[PDB]
Amino acid sequence: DDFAYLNARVRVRRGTLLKESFFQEALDLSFADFLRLLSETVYGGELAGQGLPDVDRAVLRTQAKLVGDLPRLVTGEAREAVRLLLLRNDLHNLQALLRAKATGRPFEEVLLLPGTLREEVWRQAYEAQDPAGMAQVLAVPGHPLARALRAVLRETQDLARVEALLAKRFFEDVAKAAKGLDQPALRDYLALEVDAENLRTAFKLQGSGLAPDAFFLKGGRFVDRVRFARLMEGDYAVLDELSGTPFSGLSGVRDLKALERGLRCVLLKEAKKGVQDPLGVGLVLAYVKEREWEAVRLRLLARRAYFGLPRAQVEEEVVC
Known part of the structure; x- marks a missing residue:
């Protein structure tokens, strides 16, 4: 394992990373124009459908070649x-x-x-x-x-x-167990994935009265045992008790949409730490993850352009 060697050889594909400035052009196109935006590059010859199975084919054929098969391309x-x-x-x-x-x-x-x-x-x-x-x-x-x-x-x-x-x-x-790698950024990212799985499950069941203090699963990055239980009880005060971590500023935050927006931004920022890493998956991690979060929002925006959905009417849910 490592990617730094393939990276410099792969940066040739990174020429297709599109950030907010791409998405700004896309939100303003008719469904036919959105089809052109993508067709003005190499992807233009892979788009040919409208529903999930159609968007998947466009993402599948490309993702298959850059991600889907990647386990055979590294050692x-x-x-x-x-x-x-x-x-x-x-x-x-x-x-x-x-x-x-x-x-x-x-x-x-x-x-x-x-x-x-x-x-x-x-x-x-x-x-x-x-x-x-x-x-x-x-x-x-x-x-x-x-x-x-x-x-x-x-x-x-x-x-x-x-x-x-x-x-x-x-x-x-x-x-x-994954902490057994020499991937300082991944170690922090994985911990946040666990925190989210526990938080998503704890948040969703809030207001029942459970005493989660027995079922707590360590392994996260910033979430504690009694706070995890209290939060599932509906006491949002857990969000005010996070001093001493990157999430402290949440003190007083109240609402999932804002949490999820916050979490997605944390995971992206963590993937960015690997740009100057000499060893390990650091720079590649940022490549695969940025491709995901990029695909998630790309496939959604294609739908907004085709059906003509309001942009600011729904962006709160898709930003960090």
């Missing part, structure tokens, strides 16, 4: 970084397959995202009835965690553990 530690992304896509296709699989929908109606398992793995993963088949499919590519999930699915498939054991259990250890 050592860097290979683990991209390799983890694909393993997370196995969760997409599994969650999506489990929900349909429960009743016998054909495979031809499911979308598969490129991940750690070959396209033919999913076609077989679905095909296996017992947890060995589902797990063996995950392990055929020598995946050391696939073999671990085998023992769990052989013994338990209840929906709560599956939803968690795949990630919870895979990310519970992975998250804090």
Whole structure:
């Protein structure tokens, strides 16, 4: 692993990073003009659809070539970084397959995202009835965690553990275990991903009365045990108790839309730290992550341009 060597060779593709100044031209086009903006470069010959499956093809064919296959393009530690992304896509296709699989929908109606398992793995993963088949499919590519999930699915498939054991259990250890890399920026970024998963779950259930002080999961970056519980109780005072971290200024903040806007900005700023890193995924991390957050907002703006949505009517939700 590392990317600094491919980076200087890849910066040739970074010539297509578009920041706010791109998005400002796009918000003002008719749906046909938006189609031109993208067509005025190399992407113009890959756009050819209107719904999710159409936008996906434009993102898929490109992302497939720069991200989807990246695990084969790096070695050592860097290979683990991209390799983890694909393993997370196995969760997409599994969650999506489990929900349909429960009743016998054909495979031809499911979308598969490129991940750690070959396209033919999913076609077989679905095909296996017992947890060995589902797990063996995950392990055929020598995946050391696939073999671990085998023992769990052989013994338990209840929906709560599956939803968690795949990630919870895979990310519970992975998250804090991941600190075993020499990636000072990633160590901080991952901790924030855990904080968000705990916060999103805690926020969503707020107002019930739970005593989360037993179920707290360490591994984050700035979120504490009794605050995590209090916040889930609806006492927003947790947002006023964060002195001593980057989130302290939130003291008094009140509302998810503003939180989520704040969190997205933190994760982007953390990805930016790697621009001058000599070793490790620092600069590449910024490349993949900026491509994500860029894709999220690009695909959405295509829709605003086509249907003619107000720009400031909805930007609060899509900014940090």
